[PDB]
Design a protein around this ligand. Structure first.
Ligand SMILES: OC[C@H]1O[C@@H](O[C@H]2[C@H](O)[C@@H](O)[C@H](O)O[C@@H]2CO)[C@H](O)[C@@H](O)[C@H]1O
Ligand SMILES: OC[C@H]1O[C@@H](O[C@H]2[C@H](O)[C@@H](O)[C@H](O)O[C@@H]2CO)[C@H](O)[C@@H](O)[C@H]1O
Ligand SMILES: [Mg+2]
Ligand SMILES: [Mg+2]
Lengths: 733, 733
């Protein structure tokens, strides 16, 4: 190609110093002061920047390139996870939309806004499967299902990169965290991951492959061990699998200080040996620790690495810059030199309509006793709890360049909706935690949690006076965003105790109690499901969160969100997930005995299963019908069902298709998602839903990692959640 | 060999019906009524019996063999886990002795008593590694450490089997549960086990190999999947590994209904296919479901199995009976035909001296503020709690033929110890649980828990009056044995709530509070460690438990037990174990960062670490000294330390040696136990302790299961627990 000629001609000009400079990815910080970094760019010693995110600041770096010998342009990256300046819901909330077009819209707008500020790359999407609700990074993924997360992984990559990676409104996707990062033992961040190869191939690796097959330009390597070998030093993972088996042609990027962390993992006794392990494993670009620039020349001179190791790494960096259009115009995302200056954070540069529409789709109605919701815009509404007026929490963790002061709180959304037609009464009620050690943690590094200095009792008495003066209570409760972030693993999945004390006292007033939950992970909600009159899961809903939440609470939008991760009854049940194996002694409704796979001291199964979520209307499914009883190899089967809105309000629901392979050479899950359809219906409307199934839906990795579909029975389940289904069978020939 | 000749000549005479009959293992019960079973034994349709446990009942079954054509004798098995009639501590408490001779004595007496009743075989030892405290079967193992569990696995097998399996006081060991059963996901019994091969080989499989290499005659196959394949159908596990790699020449026995359970696992669609999978995998003997007798003839005639499958399985049964001496004399464990009858449960047939001496060694002193223990035999002692007068709970789960009415309760042990020197005041204080659903579960089959009909409040007021009338309170609290048994997985590791309400009320009296804990698993003891004045862990200490516990509490025995399983701070930390990996971002207890592998909402690390346990005396260790800084291949290294009793009472402690391999081609544990010495010292005595290390101590399984020692640094740690050590390094050349 012209591309491989261009790259080979450029690399034939480069010294090893220049090639190694391309591998260096750095941020402005205590480790890399701005002026020292600018001098290094002028010297050709920097390949890319992260965490510089405004047009003037990015232009100033790109300007320094003109002073180097070869003038190779930088690329600029950032953590655009669920929004750049207009923040969408957290990924776990986006997944609850069950709508690839909603997810695509969030990614497209994110890319538009990030590229509008001069960024070329996001460290996104995060596509790690999560089965352990304790892990603080569950908020960054799409939940527990391999099918859904694989589909959304490909959608996010395509939406970011567009039809052309050189387009000024495109960014390159660096899919993360390769691999298995969300299986951390104990749900402790960065911890050991240990799993069988069949589980790895069938359940955990497919989302990364979906990103590679969608054309992701980059892969960000994870921080964890995989079966004893840190990903950063894992040649099987980064070379044999990612390059040789999957055919990935793009850029591998280390995580932050990950090469140096090989010493703490016990793979290397010094930085020189760590550098050798990372580059030979297949890590191209070294984030922040500068080990590559410090040690690659010495390693090469000693014969401890090959010239081909440097050349591979450099070619991948240059090829990413080529695809981004940066050799054609290094300023293609930076406008013209005499464009007038502007306010990066101007209102007119936000996308509030997209954020509000997307955030409505993710909200999950978990409980609604006797039609309490939707509320009428009238009377006296008490708005109570530490998350009601929180701008910092509504934008979530990994909020990129989001500005808390631009965010709509739940309180403000309700004020906007009711204008002068209803009276809102506010009381904080409790601090986010009553445990001072937890507040100390959450205010470590940055003051992110406002602490009311009053006693817990004084806050409670104020909230009880407010509730007593109202017709009903909207309690806005749950986690602060720093409880569901990197390194914030939890041993308790309940609402914090200070807030549960508040909820118990509010319940005792007899006022109708509506819970508006914010949180970044599944929560244990047994008391709430028994006592609250209605419960709306809002995740962290973003810059327009409070307006989208008010839209649902007042019935402008009929809640349509459904869970993509199972909600355990308690932390002592972890893990719970819907695509588990039967065991020899299943406990389910049809197997209720003592000598089954169960706990004895708590009810069994999730409180809310995968695919659960209610509506202000009711839906009906006709009987499931398959197009035949037998499926030949090479053929497709259809599964048909009619969905009807049998209630009085328009709304959407999600029709889910699951497969079981009840007899196989491995024990296969009791159900596995293999299709879904989100459908919006007016009252009395029907839609015929046709699912297609072929052999590709039926295959699995056996003990020898053969990817096989075995002849025999398959069971096809359809329903509006993973627990409320019916089945029909066919036979594969 | 005489055995091979004898078996070949017998099998050459046998029909396939006779060979298949040898594979059938059954119990008298609903499924096999006694008289029908006796007719089947006469017809040569039965190979062995389990759960028939008295000499007259066993002799009656062996008498039926005379009616079969070849008169092949039965063998008789039972679950003699930690005692037959004289019950020793549960295994987790036996392990806490750190004394292979104490563990061997428990096994030898168990074998003496079981063989005295006519039994030939125990389904024991249980050698599954346990890192998940929720699992109800942790009580049956030896804790979390591979070295210690492997050592005790071999000790148990040799103690059962003696110098000759034909000796009338020997029984055959059927080591269980092969394999990985204790790694059940979620700690739910029977659940999925999924792990890497390096973890399997390094940490989980060595105890089963130790039993094989100690000459175990039988292996009981587990109920769980291993990486998707049920053990019962796992040809890799039962044939490639157990026979071809490890050289096992004995008998494999299915678990209870395990062949039929291949249908529920989704490996088979019918009983015929389940039978085929089990026999071809390598399961010789079919427990209770009778699938082998029903289907093997049809499978053979269809060519779906080979004659060699039946012949392998039959040869292994005959070989077990040969080694048990049953072809030389089928009545060798059943006395003479005219022996007088006797009372099986006579006091004169118990071994109370041995039970008391053994039970003393496993008790673990967890806390002792200001030398409250040992108690003087004087004053007024309140004995309070639901476990104080419990005979059924002190003998534990898997109590075999133990008779609760023969057991010494904690109350009775204290009464025996003090005679008239002190006054005991009793109050039950609380029921074992306040939750009627849990009490109904525990009493669902048999009355196992006495439910005091009084209200919780009346029991508490009685206990508070009792405490006020006393000088100090001994609170006997924890789990009932049915909480730590097969299928009894727990979501909460605390003392039950009814009992914690009692403890808090007792604390508020200001009386000194001694907790005597009974339990079959690690418990979460944060409140207790803060508030109790002293804490003694007694596990379930067996038929003489109450006397052994009083021995420690009054200082006749200086506590010397040490934990063999880490005690988590809460269930939300599971798993916690001492031989974990460092990660790239380890948390430092002395300078603890946010961006480390940790929880934010609880203190980190176990409450009590592996190897922890206090004494009534003080011990000192001199500096660790290694015999050299460099170790040549094939040479031995010595690690020396002097232990001194620097206190005022005689006592024992356990000096533990740990190794770390800080740079390796896999991430290795922060430490691994590689030796120990239990040492009893009078005051002022000193012992030079010499550990020997060579290459075998330094090897590990790499990613490709190469089992070698890599040259480089090793760190040697010695101390009296896993957390408080001193360290020196050497280099392997
Ligand atoms: O630890 C906070 C610190 O993390 C750095 O590295 C991030 C990386 O940017 C991101 O893509 C990945 O998902 O997580 C890494 C942390 O595990 C960030 O670059 C830096 O800005 C901080 O956010
Ligand atoms: O389920 C209670 C039932 O278990 C049967 O099988 C036991 C087996 O005897 C024992 O060795 C093993 O460790 O556990 C199995 C259950 O998982 C017993 O045979 C029967 O007596 C009951 O105890
Ligand atoms: Mg099948
Ligand atoms: Mg080493």
């Amino acid at each position: 190609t012209d591309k491989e000629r261009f790259i080979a001609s450029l690399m034939a000009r480069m010294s090893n110093a220049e090639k190694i400079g391309q591998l260096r990815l750095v941020s402005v910080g205590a480790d890399h002061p701005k002026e020292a970094l600018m001098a290094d760019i002028r010297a050709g010693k920097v390949g890319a920047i992260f965490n510089t995110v405004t047009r003037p600041d990015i232009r100033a770096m790109q300007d320094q390139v003109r002073h180097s010998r070869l003038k190779i342009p930088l690329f600029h990256a950032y953590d655009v996870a669920h929004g750049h300046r207009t923040i969408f819901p957290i990924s776990l909330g986006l997944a609850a939309s069950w709508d690839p077009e909603v997810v695509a819209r969030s990614a497209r707008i994110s890319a538009l806004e990030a590229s509008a500020d001069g960024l070329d790359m996001s460290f996104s999407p995060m596509v790690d499967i999560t089965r352990d609700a304790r892990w603080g990074r569950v908020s960054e993924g799409f939940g527990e299902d391999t099918y859904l997360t694989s589909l959304l992984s490909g959608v996010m990559v395509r939406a970011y990169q567009g039809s052309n990676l050189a387009a000024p409104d495109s960014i390159m996707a660096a899919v993360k965290h390769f691999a298995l990062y969300g299986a951390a033992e104990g749900g402790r961040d960065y911890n050991t991951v240990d799993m069988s190869l069949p589980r790895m191939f069938q359940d955990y690796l497919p989302p990364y492959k979906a990103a590679v097959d969608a054309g992701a330009g980059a892969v960000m390597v994870s921080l964890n061990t995989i079966n004893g070998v840190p990903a950063t030093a894992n040649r099987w993972l980064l070379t044999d699998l990612l390059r040789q088996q999957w055919g990935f042609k793009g850029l591998t990027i280390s995580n932050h200080g990950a090469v140096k962390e090989l010493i703490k993992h016990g793979l290397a006794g010094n930085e020189r040996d760590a550098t050798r392990l990372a580059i030979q494993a297949g890590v191209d670009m070294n984030m922040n620790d500068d080990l590559y620039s410090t040690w690659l020349p010495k390693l090469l001179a000693a014969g401890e690495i090959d010239q081909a190791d440097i050349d591979r790494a450099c070619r991948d960096v240059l090829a990413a810059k080529y695809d981004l259009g940066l050799f054609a115009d290094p300023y293609r995302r930076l406008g013209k030199p005499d464009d007038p200056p502007f306010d990066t954070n101007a209102e007119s540069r936000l996308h509030r309509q997209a954020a509000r529409e997307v955030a409505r789709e993710g909200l999950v109605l978990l409980k609604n006793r006797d039609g309490l919701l939707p509320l009428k815009k009238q009377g006296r509404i008490a708005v109570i709890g530490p998350l009601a007026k929180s701008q910092r929490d509504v934008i979530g963790s990994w909020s990129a360049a989001g500005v808390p002061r631009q965010a709509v709180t739940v309180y403000q959304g309700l004020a906007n909706a009711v204008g002068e037609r209803a009276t809102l009464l506010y009381a904080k009620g409790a601090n986010v935690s009553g445990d001072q050690a937890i507040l100390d943690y959450l205010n470590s590094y940055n003051p992110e949690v406002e602490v009311d200095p009053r006693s817990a009792e004084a806050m409670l008495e104020e909230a009880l006076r407010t509730a007593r003066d109202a017709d009903l209570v909207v309690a806005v409760v749950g986690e602060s965003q720093g409880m569901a972030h990197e390194a914030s693993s939890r041993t308790d999945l309940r609402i914090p105790a200070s807030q549960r004390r508040l909820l118990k006292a509010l319940k005792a007033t007899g006022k109708p109690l509506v819970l508006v939950l914010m949180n970044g992970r599944p929560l244990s909600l047994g008391w709430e499901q028994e006592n609250a009159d209605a419960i709306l899961e809002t995740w962290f809903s973003g810059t327009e969160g409070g307006n989208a939440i008010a839209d649902v609470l007042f019935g402008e939008h009929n809640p349509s969100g459904k869970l993509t991760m199972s909600f355990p009854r308690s932390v002592g049940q972890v893990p719970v997930y819907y695509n588990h194996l039967n065991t020899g002694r299943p406990m389910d409704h049809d197997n209720p005995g003592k000598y089954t796979s169960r706990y004895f001291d708590e009810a069994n199964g999730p409180l809310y299963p995968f695919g659960y979520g209610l509506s202000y209307t009711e839906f009906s499914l006709s009987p499931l019908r398959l197009s035949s009883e037998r499926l030949a190899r090479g053929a497709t089967l259809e599964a048909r069902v009619t969905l009807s809105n049998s209630g009085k309000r328009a709304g959407a629901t999600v029709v889910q298709l699951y497969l079981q392979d009840p007899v196989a050479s491995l024990s296969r899950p009791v159900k596995e998602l293999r299709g879904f359809r989100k459908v919006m219906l007016e009252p009395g409307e029907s839609r015929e839903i046709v699912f297609r199934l072929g052999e590709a839906d039926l295959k699995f990795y056996d003990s020898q990692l053969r990817h096989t579909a075995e002849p025999g029975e398959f069971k096809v389940f359809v329903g509006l959640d993973s627990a409320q289904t019916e089945s029909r069978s066919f036979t594969l020939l």
